[PDB]
Amino acid sequence: STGSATTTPIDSLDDAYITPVQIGTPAQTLNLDFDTGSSDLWVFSSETTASEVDGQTIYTPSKSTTAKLLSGATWSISYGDGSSSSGDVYTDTVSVGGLTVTGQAVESAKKVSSSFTEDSTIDGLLGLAFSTLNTVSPTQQKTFFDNAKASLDSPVFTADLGYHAPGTYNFGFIDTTAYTGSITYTAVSTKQGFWEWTSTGYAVGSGTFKSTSIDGIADTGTTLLYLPATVVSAYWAQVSGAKSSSSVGGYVFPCSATLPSFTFGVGSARIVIPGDYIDFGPISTGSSSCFGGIQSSAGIGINIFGDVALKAAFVVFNGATTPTLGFASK
């Protein structure tokens, strides 16, 4: 089997991407944030504290003839951005782009943090990291991909995120028309539950490539590119007037700037992030100071190849017995 679904930016900055997901019988379609950095499929629901719902579409398990309470199961998650959610668990039928999993754990939120409430466009998350990170207790549950894998034509999914435009998540096949040149594959460590890999280096603009190992995670659920402070300083030094602002919480730059590209290595291959991908617009409405899309990972504890990086590539998440990651230009 295979599935193919379009993923759409939630706003003009590509702050996140949403993908429609069918849950239950009859289908209830919710727009979920596909997150290769976590492993819970959770939704706003009829059980979510009313004051914490503000415009989201909710899953109502009582209206699904295939929903079953997973007795005794609870979940609770906190994300790298400080947001969180928690609740109980149903199993139900879940379909993405024509690919159907029966008995998928659907984690129903009783509580969500303010940042979730305040984002009306995201109805929940669909985790695509390794199931070892799933938070359901006392019986850990599998991700949608993990459940679908054996049925897929090939045990893979691909992320093809757009810049200021829709893109695609495919399950079970590689669309050879969706990228240019070849796909370069690189080793993955699953030891921390992530799609963790080692970039071979970077370049800033038309500058020379610096060969250096950068361990980090491919994370579709993180907006920005978080890299070591040395690398980030080298990037922003090429932008007149750019500075790290403790008050704003990262590098900012004059909105009048033309940003240089940023290249990262995948083995001997190179992925070029155009400068415009690194512009996250005014820090506040009407400001001429703009927020940078490349930020320091210092104090995160891990480097994160978030959407800024991934949207410059066609990315293969290969869930073979020994997982790997593939990157192609597009």
The answer to whether residue 199 is catalytic is yes
| One domain for residues 168 and 24 | yes
| One domain for residues 133 and 265 | no
| One domain for residues 320 and 242 | yes
- Residue 276 Ramachandran class (φ > 0 left, ψ -120 to 50 alpha, else beta): alpha
What's the domain range around 57?
5-174
For residues 165 and 167, what is the distance between their CA atoms, to the nearest angstrom?
7
Q: Is 50 helix (H, G, I), strand (E, B) or coil?
A: helix
Among the listed residues 139, 142, 147, the one whose alpha carbon sits nearest the alpha carbon of residue 74: 139
| One domain for residues 132 and 211 | no
Copy the structure tokens of residue 247.
């008050």
| One domain for residues 284 and 238 | yes
| One domain for residues 142 and 77 | yes
Q: Is 175 helix (H, G, I), strand (E, B) or coil?
A: coil
Which candidate in 39, 199, 261, 296 is catalytic?
199
Q: Which of 131, 155, 174 is the last residue of a domain?
A: 174
| One domain for residues 47 and 179 | no
For residues 219 and 304, what is the distance between their CA atoms, to the nearest angstrom?
7
Total domains, the chain? 2
Give the list of residues 6+ apart from residue 145 with CB closer than 8 angstroms, or none: 128, 157, 171, 317, 319
Cα dihedral sign, 37-97-157-203: negative
| One domain for residues 51 and 114 | yes
Q: What number of residues does the chain have? A: 330
Copy the structure tokens of residue 162.
């757009």
Among the listed residues 181, 155, 201, 152, the one whose alpha carbon sits nearest the alpha carbon of residue 313: 181
Copy the structure tokens of residue 66.
């295939």
Q: Which of 107, 141, 174 is the last residue of a domain?
A: 174
Give me the phi and psi of 125, to 5 degrees please: -120, 150
| One domain for residues 66 and 206 | no
- Using an 8 Å Cβ cutoff, are 313 and 327 in contact? yes
Give the experimental resolution in Å. Answer: 1.3
Which candidate in 14, 33, 35, 119 is catalytic?
35
Residue with tokens 């506040």, as numbered in its chain? 284
Give me the phi and psi of 14, to 5 degrees please: 60, 45
CATH number of the domain encompassing residue 327: 2.40.70.10
Q: What is the CA radius of gyration of the chain?
A: 20
In this structure, the strands spanning 41-43 and 99-112 are parallel
Find the angle CA(186)-CA(188)-CA(190) to the nearest 5 degrees. 175
| One domain for residues 161 and 252 | no
The answer to whether residue 153 is catalytic is no
| One domain for residues 160 and 284 | no
Q: Which of 124, 150, 174 is the last residue of a domain?
A: 174
Copy the structure tokens of residue 233.
């300083």
CB count, 10 Å around CB of 31? 18
| One domain for residues 321 and 194 | yes
Among the listed residues 34, 13, 43, 78, the one whose alpha carbon sits nearest the alpha carbon of residue 195: 34
Among the listed residues 180, 220, 205, the one whose alpha carbon sits nearest the alpha carbon of residue 310: 220
Copy the structure tokens of residue 90.
């149903």
Q: How was this structure determined?
A: X-ray
- Using an 8 Å Cβ cutoff, are 300 and 167 in contact? no
